[PDB]
Amino acid sequence: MELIKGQALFLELDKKDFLSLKNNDKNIPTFAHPKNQEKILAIFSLPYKNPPQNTKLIAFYKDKKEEIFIKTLEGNYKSEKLQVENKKIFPPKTIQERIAKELKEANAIYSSYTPKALFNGAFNIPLNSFITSDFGKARTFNEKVASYHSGTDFRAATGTPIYAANSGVVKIAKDRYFAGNSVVIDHGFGIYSQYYHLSKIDVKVGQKIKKGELIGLSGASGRVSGPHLHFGILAGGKQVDPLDFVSKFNAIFQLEH
Ligand SMILES: [Zn+2]
Numbered sequence: 001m002e003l004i005k006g007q008a009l010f011l012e013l014d015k016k017d018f019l020s021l022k023n024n025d026k027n028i029p030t031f032a033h034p035k036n037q038e039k040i041l042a043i044f045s046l047p048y049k050n051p052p053q054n055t056k057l058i059a060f061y062k063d064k065k066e067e068i069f070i071k072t073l074e075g076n077y078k079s080e081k082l083q084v085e086n087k088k089i090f091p092p093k094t095i096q097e098r099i100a101k102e103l104k105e106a107n108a109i110y111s112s113y114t115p116k117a118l119f120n121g122a123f124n125i126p127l128n129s130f131i132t133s134d135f136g137k138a139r140t141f142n143e144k145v146a147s148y149h150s151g152t153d154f155r156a157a158t159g160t161p162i163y164a165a166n167s168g169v170v171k172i173a174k175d176r177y178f179a180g181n182s183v184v185i186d187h188g189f190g191i192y193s194q195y196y197h198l199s200k201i202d203v204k205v206g207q208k209i210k211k212g213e214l215i216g217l218s219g220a221s222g223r224v225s226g227p228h229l230h231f232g233i234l235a236g237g238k239q240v241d242p243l244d245f246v247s248k249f250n251a252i253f254q255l256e257h
Contacts, residue, residue, distance in 0.1 A: 001068065004075040006048035006136050008233075008240040010248055015040045017062040023055060028236075029113065031189050034253055041252070043190065045236030046072055048136055048148055077136040081143070088178065088223035089145045095177060102176045109171045109184065110192060110234055118188035120167040120211050122254035123246040126195065127154040127162065127218075127229050135241040150239040151194065151232030156218035158199050158227045164215050165193045165231070165246070170207045179230070180221025185209060191249075193242075194232035197221050 003009050012033065013021065021028045021042055033039035044057065051072050059066040091099060133153035140146055156162075164185060171192070172184035181198035199219025203209055220227035233242035 001070045002073050003044070003046050003070055004073045004241075005046045005051045006075070006239070006241055008043050008045040008235045008238075008245050008248065009070070010252060011042045011044055011057070011068070012039050013042070013059055013066075014038065014061070017064070019060040019062060021057060021059045023057050028057070029115065029190065031115070031117070043236035044070065045238040045240050046070075047238045048150070075136065077138055077148075079138040079140070080133065080149075081140050082225045084141055084223050084225050086142060089141045091177065099177050106172070106184075109186075110190075110237070112171075112186075113190055114169075114186055114188045116188055118168045118186060119191070119253070122250035123166045123193075124163070124212060125243075125246070126165045126193075126215075126231055127156060127160065129155040129160075129229075131155075132228055135243070151196070151230050152242050154229040154231060156227065156229040158217075158219050160218040160229065161214055162195055162198065162216050162218055162229060164209045164211055164213050167211045168193070168209055170203045170205055170209055170215075173201050173203050173205050173207075175221060178223045180224070181216065181219060182222075183215050185215075190235060190237065192234040194230075194234065196230035196232070197224050197228065 028042050030040045030042045033041050053072050055070040057068040132155050135152045137149040166187050168185035168187040171186050172182050176182045179196040181201050183195040185193045197219055198216040200217040202214050202216045218229040231242050233240055233245045
């Protein structure tokens with residue numbers, strides 16, 4: 001198999017007699033295939049930064065051992081230049097403790113695995129506009145700082161209503177330094193959707209949010225070159241191309257009336 005860095009894969013395996021799926025020492029969780037009762041699924045993601053060049057997954061059965069080899073592809077990401085406030089790429093010392101806390105809080109949330117579906121069928125795009133800055137663009141801020149784009153930016157004037165991409169439970173709903181006013185939703189199975197730089201937040205941490213329900217209004221909070229919506233997906237432990245993830249998720253989990 002081959003996978004572009006920064007993307008996720010849905011691996012399909014036989015359910016009968018399955019014992020465990022591992023990458024080196026780490027167990028990869030599994031969930032049921034919603035249509036094919038003979039299959040299970042797992043999410044495998046490659047990080048954009050510093051992925052391994054090759055991966056060997058091992059699936060253990062009562063009477064089989066299966067090695068799956070996935071080659072990391074570099075993809076065809078392009079570069080872009082962005083102008084932001086100098087303090088948003090070199091923050092003052094008075095603020096770096098808050099940045100430390102916020103990163104520790106998020107790490108704790110993304111490691112909190114929910115082993116059931118909190119979603120309801122397919123994801124919707126949370127904004128009906130167009131892409132202004134695609135995933136994985138190699139960035140330079142102020143001709144000083146290299147970065148990469150860990151989500152996808154949609155055109156949005158300040159105050160555009162932002163709706164939940166799928167059903168889930170709110171895990172973050174507060175102003176953070178770099179992401180601005182941030183909303184993060186746990187959808188189960190380690191899938192989290194993220195909405196950044198909002199001007200207003202309409203939910204609270206712990207809330208059960210339904211697909212298509214209002215979660216806030218877009219804005220220009222945090223590290224921005226101007227007003228927009230930033231949409232992100234974390235799955236399989238990593239930030240992945242959100243619209244690629246949604247297409248792959250929806251092929252499996254979409255429903256009909
Ligand atoms: Zn963005």
